[PDB]
Design a protein around this ligand. Structure first.
Ligand SMILES: Oc1cc(O)cc(/C=C/c2ccc(Br)cc2)c1
Ligand SMILES: [Zn+2]
Lengths: 261, 4
C-alpha cells in the first residue's frame, strides 16, 4: 500500500508525468470563500436555476459582483497546482469552482476545464450572442442587470446552471482520464455525477491521491490498491506534499512573485 | 448527455 511519500517520489522521478487534477470548494474556503449548505432566494439552488433567474436575476448578479476579480486571491493549494504546471507535470485541471482562482494563479486556460463555467465570458440568454465578461462588469458592478445591445435579452455570465450541458471542454475527459498517470483530487468528495465516476475512469495501475477533510466518495466506496488518502486540513496536506517533493523554496518564490508576500 |  502506497504512502504520500511514495507518490512524492514517483513525481520527483518522472514516473508521474501526466497529472490529472480534480478540485472543488475545499480549495477555495482557504481563500475566504464560504461553502454550500440571505440572498432573497426561495431555496439555495435557485441561484443557479434558469426559471428563477429569468423571474429574478438579482440574487445571481449579487453573487457575481462578490466573485468578480479583486475580492479573493488564490492560496497555497492553487499555487501548488500552478507549480505542477510550471514543472511540466499538469495534463489537466478539472474544477467545479466558479471563483476563477485557478486562472488567477496563472494556470493557462488550455490546462483548465472549468466544468461549472466561468465569469470571464457571458452569453445573451435569448439570441445567444457571446460577450466578454468585462463588457458586463460596469453594469454588474453598478447593480444593473446587463441587457443584450441587440435583442434586449438578459446577458448571463457563462456559469453553468442546473439542467444545462457541461461546457464543451468537458469532453476532454474522454481523452485525459485514460492518458493520466496520476490522479489528484483536492478539496472535494466528487459526490455529484459525472464527477464521481471520472474517478473510476483512470486505469487501475494509476495512483489516486486524495487530499481532503475526510475520506468520502468513490475512493471510500470503490477503493483500489494504489489509492492514498491524506486527510485533514487541505492546506496542511498540500504543504506536506510540497515538502516531500522538495518544492518549498519554489513555492515561496512563486507566492512572493504573484502576490507580493 | 452530461448536465449539471
Ligand atoms: O465549488 C464552488 C466554488 C465556488 O467558488 C463557489 C460555489 C458556489 C457558491 C454559492 C454561493 C451562494 C449560493 Br446561495 C450557492 C452557491 C461552489
Ligand atoms: Zn441578444
Amino acid at each position: 500500500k502506497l504512502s504520500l511519500q511514495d507518490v512524492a517520489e514517483l513525481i520527483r522521478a518522472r514516473a508521474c508525468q501526466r497529472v490529472v487534477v480534480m478540485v472543488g470548494a475545499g480549495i477555495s474556503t482557504p481563500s475566504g470563500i464560504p461553502d454550500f449548505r440571505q440572498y432573497d432566494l426561495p431555496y439555495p439552488e435557485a441561484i443557479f436555476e434558469l426559471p428563477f433567474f429569468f423571474h429574478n436575476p438579482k440574487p445571481f448578479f449579487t453573487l457575481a459582483k462578490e466573485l468578480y476579480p479583486g475580492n479573493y486571491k488564490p492560496n497555497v493549494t492553487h499555487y501548488f497546482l500552478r507549480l505542477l504546471h510550471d514543472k511540466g507535470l499538469l495534463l489537466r485541471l478539472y474544477t467545479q469552482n466558479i471563483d476563477g482562482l485557478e486562472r488567477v494563479s496563472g494556470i493557462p486556460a488550455s490546462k483548465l476545464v472549468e466544468a461549472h463555467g466561468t465569469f470571464a465570458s457571458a452569453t445573451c440568454t435569448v439570441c445567444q450572442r457571446p460577450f466578454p465578461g468585462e463588457d458586463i462588469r460596469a453594469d454588474v458592478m453598478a447593480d444593473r442587470v446587463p441587457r443584450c445591445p441587440v435583442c434586449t435579452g438578459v446577458v448571463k455570465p457563462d456559469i453553468v446552471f442546473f439542467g444545462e450541458p457541461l461546457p464543451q471542454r468537458f469532453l476532454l475527459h474522454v481523452v485525459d482520464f485514460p492518458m493520466a498517470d496520476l490522479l489528484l483530487i483536492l478539496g472535494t468528495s466528487l459526490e455529484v455525477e459525472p464527477f464521481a465516476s471520472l474517478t473510476e475512469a483512470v486505469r487501475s495501475s494509476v495512483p489516486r491521491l486524495l487530499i481532503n477533510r475526510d475520506l468520502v466518495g468513490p475512493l471510500a466506496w470503490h477503493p483500489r490498491s494504489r489509492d492514498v488518502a491524506q486527510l485533514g486540513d487541505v492546506v496542511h496536506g498540500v504543504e506536506s506534499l510540497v515538502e516531500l517533493l522538495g518544492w518549498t523554496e519554489e513555492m515561496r518564490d512563486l507566492v512572493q512573485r504573484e502576490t507580493g508576500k | 448527455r452530461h448536465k449539471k
